[PDB]
Amino acid sequence: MPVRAQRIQHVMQDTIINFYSTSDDYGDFSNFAAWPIKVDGKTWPTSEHYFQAQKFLDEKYREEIRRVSSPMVAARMGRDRSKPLRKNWESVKEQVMRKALRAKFEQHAELRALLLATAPAKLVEHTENDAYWGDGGHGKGKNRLGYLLMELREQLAIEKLEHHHHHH
């Protein structure tokens, strides 16, 4: 498990990367990776914390999910869909998660460089459990999480393509 930029030093081409193992270096691609993210002025343990903090419009409950350092606890008490959810929650998942992913890979140059390293490959989350944001084990999980990572990577590439500085 090497924490490096370019885990695979320039991937092949059209390489379908099916990853499931949050215990090693390929686990960072899984959003459930416990990498501290700095979002909107606060430090969130994982993306799910910010994700479900926007999920619920419960004032004091957001504070709870913001305070809980443990990632699995956020999933546990955030699991419930009986609580008042945002009317646009079904749509704004892409918005909230996109910014969370942004903060994750951007706040860590290691991860950002790792992200562009997986180009031009295709990232596929393979959770043999809950096929959501990841195409699952059966191939129908809405893997657009990995796609958000692809499109985010391209945005980071555009910013990088703005390279114009008197040093290199």
* Torsion sign (Cα): 21, 23, 25, 31: positive
Q: What is the DSSP string of 17-60?
A: EEE--TTSGGGTTSTTS---EEETTEEESSHHHHHHHHHB--HH
Taking alpha carbons only, the member of 55, 105, 122 closest to residue 82 is: 55
Contact 118, 8 (CB under 8 A): yes
Residues 130, 166 contacting (CB under 8 angstroms): no
The token pair at 48 is 């799910």
Reference 117, options 28, 23, 21; nearest CA is: 28
Q: For residue 53, what are its two tokens? A: 């903090």
4: helix, coil or strand? coil
- What is the rounded CA–CA span in Å between residue 133 and residue 146? 8
Strands 42-44, 16-19: pairing is unpaired
Map out the domains of the chain as residue ranges. 1-168
Superfamily of domain 1-168: YbiA-like (1.10.357.40)
Residue 101: name the closest of 110, 91, 111, 92 by CA: 111
Burial class (CB in 10 A: 0-12, 13-18, 19+), 164: exposed
Taken in order 92, 62, 109, 5, is the CA torsion positive or negative?
Answer: negative
| Whole-angstrom distance, CA of residue 15 vs CA of residue 112 | 19
Which position has the token pair 């096929």?
A: 131
What SS3 state is found at 159?
helix
> Which of the 8 DSSP states describes residue 25?
G
